Ligand binder design. Structure first.
Ligand SMILES: O=C(O)c1ccccc1-c1c2ccc(=O)cc-2oc2cc(O)ccc12
Length: 173
């Protein structure tokens, strides 16, 4: 997540999201950076049914160590509109965050986005992520993704960090 002044932007989620396709493993090929240098060029997400929700298990190798973050996702309203809640509870503290699917073809890629207000300054914290069923995007999908990131007024495509899944980035020790 990245800081910017002002209110979160207006965003239009996709309206033909297919919730059935929200399963298995997806590689995180691009994302914004995070503060305190805490990121990452080797990461992925796995999705599993948990009642009406999906359990979102995210794995990352950052500076030689494994990090794990789990949470539950479920639609805010109609499952076709990609406006969704992520929920994570640790001890007595739950955080619930609306995120948006900004672009998808429901099978090779998902581009997601979330925004939160800085309770301090008049500003906000943004995050963009790009998931892909293949480690490397190619073809139509790569075209659809580059077009979207380039056309989109919401995404700052120069702040994106790209993952290589290289031997060096993915090594734990
Ligand atoms: O997984 C999280 O930590 C998270 C928390 C709040 C909002 C979004 C996410 C979340 C992601 C956060 C960072 C990131 O690099 C990738 C994320 O991917 C998600 C994918 C989901 O389907 C559903 C949720 C996420």
């Amino acid at each position: 997540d990245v800081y910017h002044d002002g209110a979160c932007p207006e965003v239009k989620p996709v309206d033909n999201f297919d919730w059935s396709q929200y399963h298995g493993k997806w590689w995180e090929v691009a994302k914004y950076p995070s503060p305190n240098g805490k990121y990452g060029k080797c990461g992925w997400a796995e999705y599993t049914p948990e009642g009406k929700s999906v359990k979102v298990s995210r794995y990352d190798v950052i500076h030689g160590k494994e990090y794990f973050m789990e949470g539950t996702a479920y639609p805010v309203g109609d499952s076709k509109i990609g406006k969704i809640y992520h929920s994570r509870t640790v001890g007595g503290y739950t955080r619930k965050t609306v995120f948006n699917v900004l672009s998808t073809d429901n099978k090779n890629y998902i581009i997601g986005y979330s925004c939160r207000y800085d309770e301090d300054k008049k500003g906000h914290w943004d995050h963009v992520w790009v998931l892909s069923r293949s480690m490397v995007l190619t073809g139509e999908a790569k075209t659809a993704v580059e077009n979207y990131l380039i056309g989109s007024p919401v995404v700052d495509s120069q702040k994106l960090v790209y993952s290589d899944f290289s031997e060096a980035a993915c090594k734990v020790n």
